[PDB]
């Protein structure tokens with residue numbers, strides 16, 4: 115009867131992902147209008163990222179302290195505002211500022227949004243909702259740059275920011291009068307000292323952190339492409355919106371097929387085995403991605419095909435290693451998730467930044483090498499983590 119409330123959060127999750135996944139393809143348009151350089155294409159994703167790990171930590175224990183409903187809305191409100199208040203910045207120096215504050219609307223999905231379902235809805239109820247909100251994080255980056263390439267053709271870029279402010283409103287007016295709250299730390303002290311100390315505790319966990327990083331490092335060459343897959347292909351390799359949007363699928367359609375097997379071979383194998391099971395393709399992915407652009411700088415096909423191996427493997431291994439890293443520290447779910455959030459993004463954010471220049475002054479070589487760097491890193495934190 116009240117299954118309309120999860121779907122509203124489902125929608126809010128949907129919008130925030132495409133809000134980044136339809137934007138990176140049509141960032142060129144926005145660069146060739148605001149005028150700075152194609153080096154500011156990925157640096158969209160980057161400031162969108164670096165917002166998420168601002169109050170990531172503080173929003174969880176915060177949505178606890180003063181209700182879940184008014185903080186969640188301060189986020190849905192905070193999204194639609196900067197979804198239309200960025201259309202009136204018009205310069206690239208402060209497009210960042212409004213892109214960045216659109217990235218803080220990311221803490222709200224997990225640290226309070228996800229937490230509202232873990233509080234109210236019960237186990238088997240929560241399962242199908244999370245099985246849903248894991249496909250949102252899979253379909254909205256899969257098909258988002260495909261609508262984001264059929265949107266810049268029939269309309270301008272601006273049509274997106276209206277469509278998101280509106281879809282976040284279809285959810286927001288569905289949450290205006292249909293959002294019950296379950297925060298139990300009402301009327302509690304402004305205890306800020308306790309967080310840093312207790313996050314430092316999970317920070318002390320040389321099995322968890324080294325395992326939290328290795329989640330970052332592994333899933334980065336995935337995000338470093340997404341942020342640069344436009345100006346790698348459109349301007350870099352000089353291909354159209356149908357040809358570049360064609361290369362998004364062999365990658366993604368390989369990640370989906372690695373999340374097909376995972377949930378199927380979750381049974382016949384151990385979690386411990388799956389990470390090493392899905393690790394060989396990842397190793398062979400970034401092995402052959404950059405073992406392509408060796409002498410042949412511009413055989414993007416074999417790079418994208420190499421990011422189809424690597425991508426299949428992220429479906430399986432990376433997803434497994436999530437849990438074990440949660441349970442690598444026998445501590446609170448809220449503190450660990452936030453701690454591995456704020457660690458994965460710092461790998462993502464500043465990982466791309468280096469990943470950017472990796473592409474400039476080197477081209478395609480250096481970039482893919484500063485990919486296999488990360489497969490090396492993750493692997494090098496697997497010889498630690500299991501054996």
Ligand SMILES: C[C@H](CCC(=O)O)[C@H]1CC[C@H]2[C@@H]3CC[C@@H]4C[C@H](O)CC[C@]4(C)[C@H]3C[C@H](O)[C@]12C
Pocket residue numbers: 166220221223224251333373428429430432433436455
């Ligand atoms: C739980 C956070 C939400 C907090 C945040 O905004 O970062 C989300 C955001 C990004 C998510 C990850 C994206 C990459 C991965 C894709 C895999 O095929 C399935 C597991 C992974 C590892 C995901 C697991 C998890 O669902 C994450 C870490």
Ligand SMILES: [Pr+3]
Pocket residue numbers: 308312
């Ligand atoms: Pr505590």
